[PDB]
Design a binder for this molecule. Sequence first.
Ligand SMILES: O=C(O)CNC(=O)c1nc(Cl)c2ccccc2c1O
Ligand SMILES: [Mn+2]
Length: 546
Amino acid sequence: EDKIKGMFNPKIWDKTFQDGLKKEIEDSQPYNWGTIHELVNDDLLRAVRKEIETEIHFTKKETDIYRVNQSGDLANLSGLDWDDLSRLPNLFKLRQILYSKQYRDFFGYVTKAGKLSGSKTDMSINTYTKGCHLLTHDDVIGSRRISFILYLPDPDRKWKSHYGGGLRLFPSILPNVPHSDPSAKLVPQFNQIAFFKVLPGFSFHDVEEVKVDKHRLSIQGWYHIPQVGEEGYIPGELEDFEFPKDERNILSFHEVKHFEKMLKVKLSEAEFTYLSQYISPEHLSSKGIEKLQKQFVENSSLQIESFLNDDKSELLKKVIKQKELEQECPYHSKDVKAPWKTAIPPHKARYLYIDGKEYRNFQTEADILEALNNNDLPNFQFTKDAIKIISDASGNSRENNFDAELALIDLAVFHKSTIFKKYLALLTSLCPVSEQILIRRFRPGMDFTLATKCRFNELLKSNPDIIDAVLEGTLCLTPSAGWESGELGGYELYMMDSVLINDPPAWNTFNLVLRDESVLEFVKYVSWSAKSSRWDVKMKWDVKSC
Ligand SMILES: O=C(O)CNC(=O)c1nc(Cl)c2ccccc2c1O
Ligand SMILES: [Mn+2]
């Protein structure tokens, strides 16, 4: 058609504009990308927005990595059928011009992408409303070659930075290892397009949570590698960088023999006394133990309420609330200080944790390689010792004290005790043979994990006595309200590869799950709107049957 070029801003046909844009994309950071303002005929795009509002039904969908209002799921009668746009003539026209030979020649030229398919049209229409988000990903799927997003928020009002919903780009520490924190954030406006060549290991981006009751509407899509022969196209013409590691340390022979001897309520008065320092009387009585045992036999899981006793519940709630209220939480990995670490990389997870290992702050490749050449083991008492020194020098003020960290480490030490593992073996009739304990904090608007399976200990795979499962515990210490609906996120989700557990954050609960090879788990992204972080203690053990 003669009219296709005239449906765009005439600047994109100007050689001088094209060459300048090609150079800007070439020299962009943190990987090659670009943006064009006022792309399309304003009346056309306005007409498209009206059609969308009028004709398209959006359906909220939530997974580990996103919450979005989609229109594309053809498992909904509601699902948008791109083969039938009878009532969206202007949308039909928009797709036609974006995949035109004319536009593709311009666009492939400035992005240095090579040939682009005109027939492989690939678009979807979505809105992000309050709490909606999409976490870090690189778009690498199939024949996708260039990613684009055309923004259609209200054309007569400015989208503002504090609304959220920014497009964020993440720089590379090394290939397939994006930095945890983004280095650029685009605030989208009507008739702006953002785009980038899809680059395995590099083109990491996300959609910042929408923080207000506004509708962030977009059309997002891809240009693909052409079909074979299309316009003459001829084909052909990392676990190491994850922290913390999903690894456990084997227990001493002293411990393991204790558990065996017991399994072949046999705890002593002194052991019950020790347990009663932390655990509520309810769960140490003969009746309570029997109930928990029966529950674990039937479900291969426990969900305990009011796990810790009142003394320790009161202490931990106090110091955690004080820290929430009176201290400045770091919101960039560079600002995080001992004893905390940031989980990396961000296309897998982001949260703060205490593991008892020497301090690490991963800003460069050198930082990571140094850790990989010098593996060290957890030691929580040394971590405590280190905190005291830091703490004395500064002065232990309301603003800088480590009261929460010290109380939490004391709790970790309890769960590390031989006697606690004996109680665990009693509840489960399983013998722990390894352990990993982590204290975790999931900050509002930053932190999450994605759905993953347990990681078997490879060295133990051939041991017949060791169960093909990982026993996993979670002690939640989240003192704030408003979580019950799941709307603020932070819920612990266990599901089969159908949901086994879906528990929003709560105060003083203990979940215990025997995971076989296929069970998936994650902690959902915590909304910016949450009233505190999710705080918990995570425990994992290899087990043998005795
Ligand atoms: O909207 C934006 O600024 C960035 N959006 C995305 O990167 C994005 N990426 C993918 Cl892979 C999908 C995929 C499906 C639906 C929406 C998506 C999306 O908004
Ligand atoms: Mn994307």
